[PDB]
Amino acid sequence: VSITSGASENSCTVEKKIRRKFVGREEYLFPPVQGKLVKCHVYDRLKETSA
C-alpha cells in the first residue's frame, strides 16, 4: 500500500503469500461466462457490513 503525493510518498509492504485460488473442482483464471453456480464465499464490498 502506498501514498503517491510526491511529498507524502511513503509506502508499506508485508510478506503474505497470496496465490490465486479457485472455488470448485476446476482451475479457472476468470469466472466462466457460463457454467454451474456453486456456493462460494466472497468479501462483501458493502462498507457497512461487519465481519
Partner 1 sequence: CPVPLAHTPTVTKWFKGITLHLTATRPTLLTTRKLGLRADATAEWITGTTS
Partner 2 sequence: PYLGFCPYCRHSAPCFSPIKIENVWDESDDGSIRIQVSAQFGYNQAGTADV
Partner 3 sequence: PGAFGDIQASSLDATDIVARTDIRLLKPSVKNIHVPYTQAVSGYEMWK
Q: Which residues bind partner 1 (CB under 8 A)?
A: 22-29, 31-38, 40, 42
How far apart CA 35 and CA 11 sit, in angstroms, is 41
Q: Which is nearer to partner 2, 42 or 51 (CB)?
A: 42
43 near partner 2 (CB under 8 A): no
CA nearest neighbour of 14 among 24, 25, 22, 2: 2
How far apart CA 15 and CA 1 sit, in angstroms, is 12
Q: Which is nearer to partner 1, 6 or 31 (CB)?
A: 31
Partner in contact with 38, chosen from partner 3, partner 1, partner 2, none, beta carbon below 5 to 8 Å by kind:
partner 1
